[PDB]
Amino acid sequence: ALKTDQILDKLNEKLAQVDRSKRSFTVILFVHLRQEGKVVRSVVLDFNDLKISEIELAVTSTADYPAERIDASITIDDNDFYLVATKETSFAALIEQGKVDITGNKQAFLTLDEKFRNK
């Protein structure tokens, strides 16, 4: 039971409203959610197909998303991800505070901050 579970419906709502025929931001982001310092759930934010889906726990790549296809990955506490998703903080602020680990293209998360704020 994650705080993040409480906000998934609202995020799916916002994804459903994105226009499908004029696509410009199509990154694949892996998100590894922590509770008490260990990864307890992993999800993919798939901006190509515009979906969020659960993946195998803590994995680096999958058959559908091989390594060369993943743009960036973030390890983040469940509570902090819920705060970003509810627009109470940003990825930029969490990076400034040392609260997250990001591999791959860090700029993808900073750009996501900017796109999400208008949605």
Q: Which two tokens stand for residue 86?
A: 């509810």
**Per-position x/- string for 5-34, each x denoting binding to ligand PLM as judged by CB under 6 A, each - no binding:** ------x--xx--x----xxx---------
Q: Whole-number minimum distance, CB 6 to ligand PLM, in Å?
A: 14
Q: Closest CB to ligand PLM among 23 and 38?
A: 23
Q: Closest CB to ligand PLM among 70 and 85?
A: 85
Q: Closest CB to ligand PLM among 24 and 96?
A: 24
Q: Whole-number minimum distance, CB 11 to ligand PLM, in Å?
A: 5
Among 28, 33, 43, 45, binds ligand PLM (CB under 6 A): 45
Does 72 contact ligand PLM by CB under 6 A?
Answer: no
Q: Whole-number minimum distance, CB 25 to ligand PLM, in Å?
A: 4
Q: What are phi and psi of 92, to 5 degrees?
A: -50, -45
Rounded to whole angstroms, the Cα distance separating 99 from 107 reads: 17
Q: Which two tokens stand for residue 115?
A: 């796109």
Rounded to whole angstroms, the Cα distance separating 110 from 94 reads: 11
How far apart, in Å, are the Cα atoms of 51 and each of 3, 27, 28, 117? 19, 11, 10, 18
Cβ atoms 73, 104 nearer than 8 A: yes
